[PDB]
């Protein structure tokens, strides 16, 4: 460089450190310049003698480089600053600059860019180095830089791993691992099969680490070593059972401090969210993992046996008992993945045991064992239910209050995991069970805690099971009410309320006394009025309103003091009252809309909330993400942060919005052009969150039918309309292109005849081509390493396009053309869901084309007439129902196929056709061969007849009493007995003037013959009959 250049950019750079802004703007509006800026730069990292300056100037031109690109730079210059960062990298600097070149070095290295032969005989030597930090750099720049290591011949490549893993510092070590693990994330599979070899000297050089002590150092290779359990779990098959020993051995070491103990539970865990074919295959998995987690979680109160600080204390779990907590996720996370086929034996020969010990910690663990594996292993478990109470309940009495605690803990657990059977089968023994803690005999944590799982249980418990226990649950809940500790009080509170919910109408006795002394709760701590509040209102919900209307308007007085009180914390609050405003609208019905100025204020505020985005920079990222509140992601290689807190607020509030306005339907017009403009519409264009664009679409058929129950009209649902149709092509998830497809259906149900444009129609189109497309694409998809959303997006594009055929009366079957390829294509795939798919458009051509659909006969009655006969039942279904279809509505132009297929349809109609998972198929097909015999001798409608009574299918169901109904009034045993019922059968089970008809035929027999007909019939279902008949 030009020796002054060097001067203002040495003054420049010493600025930086500390003058720092002016430096800043210097370098960013002057430094035509970027060359020599960046040779600069490097020459510092390389050469200078002070720290802070060659560290700083790493790290700006390892910025500047990305940004330039590296690419647009001139070779001459390149070259120049390859070797001066080389030269660099070879000569004296600290650990830290070392580092700092490495990373600039890596910025160096591209595809495009010339070769750099350099650099690879740079890093061969130096992992020859007996300086470590020449040996871990350049592991690192293999890290950062992968495809260097395809750039080395083979035989000398593993070696340099072999090494590395085996290396005697510890840093190398990590190094090393990190740059093995780094090049399957960076590179494709093909080139696995070419490092993965290694994984035996990996694994061998791990108990190593145990030797010389350095566990924390093997906590750091667990972690790498869990990310290729994700990448590449079948590669550790031939040595699964060392490694499960391994960290069975490890996690034993209690003696280890705990990340070494908790990165080897992850590890030992994570096989089974990868390869659970795997870890099912090995029976030492399961038991291990078992055994392991049982131990950890003994690993509590410790150093306080009586557990006095823990009575003391609230309860909040303390998160200081790590090992603990990991355990007891494990067991869960492992649980669910594999199941009780695999888990229940191994998990209960261990806790036969420790329910029996006379150490409290290990009858604890037992419990919470239980309670994180019942939901997993509820496929087996939900049989063995009084087993577990037998071994559970003993202990609900345990002379230590944490096994106490424990105990109510699982009883809560499995109400929920073996709900609804357990509560049907079980209230005898658990709800004494739990009320017997209620007492103040117990301890407040035992007290509040049975009052947890009384919440649990009534989740799922029937208004008539709870009944005779609500006098004895209520009396000791309302002592607890007066408790000394908040959380006492609250938890009260919260029982209090979730039991009224469950006892409905049950509840309607008590509230006469309960309502007060919550009145003297708020007159009176923001949770607990919160939880005060929820608990009146839904006591309130559970009594109805005329009941609710005593104490109604006070309850609102105390509300609107709550909402716009002062203080805005606890943000708890907000929530509660919300849900309660919520749920007085349940109760009020129209009474509320006097109160919709006080509650849709505050949600329009938060529903209006903008994508709260910051477009970032890349170390700007780790420490916005330190923020629950917070999340960045990369779209395009340019990162950014999300203000995630703030966009779940709004959905939020877009469903208490939306609710609302379901609810107060003509009432809510006043809001619907706001909502629909400022929120709804706005909401779909919110391209990083999708729970906003699925709330934005939901909202908008409610909000159009809320005006509509009050031209408008019309400009809101074309806006709204269009912008659905253009999300089509637009959206990437296939979850959200449901959405909009479910959303335009509902509009166009509200919105009725004719509601789109032509080229709306063609822009739907487009949409539909796009989807299906990508569909297909999706499913030609689904090895070596590794072990509906689909089929529900295709029922909603059958949806629309049913909807829109509709809403055209037949003129979008000209739009429908265009797509016929796809449809095609479909129909004689393999895969049954397209099939589906085609045969059900197939099906809606017809009912709107009529004998329109001429054109199309020849191509797809030879597929259809086929799926007659298929295996899949909803295949013959919807084969089915496009022949019953066409007889319907394009008579003459089908008999050549309907009447010869008739038999067809005798046949489907006949072993397992009366049975629930094809009961449905075989009703399509029954109504099928009624639709030929309407259209256009006997033998047949006999046979018909034996298919009576259609329970399932609606539309079906519908044809063949219409068809029954005719085959009387105006047309013609002992088949009577068999028309009623047919007919009992099919009201009475909610699938369909027959009535009218069956009245005749009974008048042609005596009074005696015709009573007779109804002995068999129950009291419910004649008390039914009775008010059916004429």
């Not at 660099?88 to 700092?100: M, Y």
């Not at 994984?199 to 108990?207: A, C, R």
């Amino acid at each position: 460089l030009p020796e002054e250049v060097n001067r203002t950019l040495l003054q420049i750079v010493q600025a930086f450190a500390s003058i720092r802004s002016v430096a800043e703007k210097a370098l960013s509006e002057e430094w035509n310049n970027i060359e020599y800026l960046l040779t600069f730069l490097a020459e510092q990292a390389a050469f200078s003698q002070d720290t802070t300056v060659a560290a700083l100037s790493a790290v700006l031109f390892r910025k500047l480089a990305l940004k330039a690109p590296i690419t647009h730079i001139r070779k001459e210059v390149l070259a120049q600053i390859r070797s001066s960062l080389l030269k660099g990298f070879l000569s004296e600097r600290a650990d830290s600059i070392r580092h700092k070149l490495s990373d600039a070095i890596a910025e160096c290295v591209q595809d495009d860019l010339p070769a750099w032969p350099e650099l690879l005989q740079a890093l061969i030597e130096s992992l020859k180095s007996g300086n470590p930090n020449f040996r871990e750099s350049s592991f690192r720049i293999l890290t950062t830089v992968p495809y260097l290591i395809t750039a080395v011949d083979i035989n000398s490549i593993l070696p340099i791993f072999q090494s590395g893993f085996t290396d005697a510092s510890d840093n190398v070590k990590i190094a090393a691992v990190t740059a093995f693990v780094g090049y399957f994330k960076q590179l494709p599979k093909s080139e696995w099969s070419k490092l993965g070899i290694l994984l035996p000297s990996l694994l061998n050089s791990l108990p190593r680490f145990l030797d010389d002590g350095k566990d924390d150092a093997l906590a750091s290779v667990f972690e790498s070593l869990i990310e290729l359990v994700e990448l590449a779990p079948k590669l550790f098959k031939d040595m699964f059972d060392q490694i499960i020993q391994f960290t069975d051995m490890v996690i034993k070491n209690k003696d280890l401090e705990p990340p070494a103990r908790t990165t080897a539970l992850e590890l030992l865990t994570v096989f089974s969210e990868n390869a659970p074919q795997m870890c099912k295959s090995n029976q030492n998995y399961g038991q291990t993992l078992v055994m392991v987690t049982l131990i950890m979680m003994t690993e509590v109160s410790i150093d306080d046996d009586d557990a006095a600080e823990w009575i003391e204390s609230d309860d909040t779990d303390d998160e200081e008992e790590v090992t603990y907590d990991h355990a007891a996720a494990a067991l869960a996370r492992v649980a669910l993945k594999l199941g009780g086929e695999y888990l229940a034996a191994p998990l209960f020969q261990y806790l036969q045991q420790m329910i029996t010990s006379t150490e409290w910690r290990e009858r604890f663990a037992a419990m919470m064992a239980l309670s994180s594996a019942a939901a997993g292993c509820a496929d087996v478990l939900i049989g063995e239910i009084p087993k577990i109470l037998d071994m559970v309940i003993p202990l609900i009495n345990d002379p230590h209050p944490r096994v106490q605690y424990g105990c109510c803990k699982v009883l809560g657990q499995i109400s929920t995991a073996f709900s609804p059977f357990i509560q049907r089968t079980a209230h005898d023994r658990i709800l004494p069970a739990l009320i017997s803690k209620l007492t103040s005999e117990c301890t407040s944590r035992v007290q509040t805690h049975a009052a947890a799982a009384l919440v649990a249980f009534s989740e799922f418990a029937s208004k008539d099971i709870l009944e005779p226990y609500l006098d004895s649950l209520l009396t000791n809940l309302l002592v607890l009410l007066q408790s000394n500790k908040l959380y006492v009080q609250e938890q009260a509170l919260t029982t209090i309320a979730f039991i009224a919910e469950a006892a409905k109408n049950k509840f309607i006795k008590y509230y006469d006394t309960l309502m007060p002394l919550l009145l003297n709760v708020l007159k009176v701590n923001s949770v607990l009025k919160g939880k005060c509040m929820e608990c009146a209102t839904l006591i309130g919900f559970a009594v109805g309103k005329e009941k609710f209307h005593e104490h109604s308007q006070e309850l609102i007085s105390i509300l609107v003091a709550l909402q716009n009180s002062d203080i805005d914390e606890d943000d708890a609050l907000r929530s509660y009252l919300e849900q309660s405003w919520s749920r007085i609208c349940r109760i009020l019905g129209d009474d509320f809309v006097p109160l919709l100025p006080i509650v849709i204020p505050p949600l329009l505020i938060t529903a209006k909330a903008t994508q709260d985005v910051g477009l970032i920079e890349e170390e700007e990222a780790a420490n916005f993400q330190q923020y629950p509140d917070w999340d960045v992601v990369q779209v395009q290689g340019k990162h950014i942060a999300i203000h995630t807190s703030v966009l779940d607020d709004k959905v939020s509030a877009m469903e208490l919005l939306q609710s609302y306005a379901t609810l107060l339907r003509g009432q809510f017009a006043v809001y619907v052009k706001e909502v629909m403009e400022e929120i709804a519409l706005p909401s779909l264009d919110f391209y990083l969150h999708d729970g906003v664009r699925a709330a934005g679409a939901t909202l908008i058929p409610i909000l159009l039918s809320c005006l509509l129950a009050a031209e408008e009209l019309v400009l809101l649902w074309h806006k709204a309309s269009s912008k659905l149709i253009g999300g089509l092509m637009s959206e990437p998830m296939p979850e959200i292109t449901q959405v909009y497809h479910n959303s335009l259906v509902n509009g166009i149900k509200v919105m009725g005849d004719n509601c789109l444009s032509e080229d709306q129609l063609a822009a739907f189109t487009k949409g539909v081509s796009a989807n299906l497309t990508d569909t297909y694409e999706r499913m030609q998809d689904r090895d070596e390493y590794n072990e509906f959303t689909d089929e529900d997006l295709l029922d909603e594009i059958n949806k629309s396009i049913a909807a829109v055929l509709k809403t055209t009366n037949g003129h979008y079957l000209k739009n429908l053309e265009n797509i016929w390829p796809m449809i095609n294509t479909f129909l004689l795939d393999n895969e049954p869901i397209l099939v589906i798919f085609a045969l059900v458009v197939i099906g809606d051509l017809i009912q709107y084309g009529g004998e329109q659909t001429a054109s199309m006969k020849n191509a797809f009655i030879p597929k259809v007439t086929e799926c007659l006969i298929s295996p899949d039942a909803r295949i013959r279904q919807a084969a089915s129902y496009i022949i019953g279809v066409c007889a319907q509505y394009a008579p003459s132009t089908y008999a050549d196929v309907c009447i010869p297929t008739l038999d067809t349809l005798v046949q489907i109609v006949d072993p397992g056709s009366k049975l629930e998972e094809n009961r449905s198929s075989t009703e399509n097909a029954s109504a099928a061969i009624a639709k030929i015999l309407y259209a256009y001798v006997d033998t047949y409608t006999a046979n018909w007849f034996k298919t009576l009574p259609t329970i399932t299918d609606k539309e079906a169901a519908s044809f063949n009493y219409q068809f029954l109904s005719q085959l009387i009034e105006n047309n013609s045993q002992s088949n009577i007995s068999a028309v009623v019922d047919s007919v009992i059968q099919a009201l009475n089970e909610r699938s369909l003037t027959v009535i009218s008809s069956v009245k005749k035929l009974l008048g042609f027999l005596p009074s005696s013959d015709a009573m007779a007909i109804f002995n068999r019939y129950p009291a419910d279902i004649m008390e039914k009959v009775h008010k059916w008949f004429a």
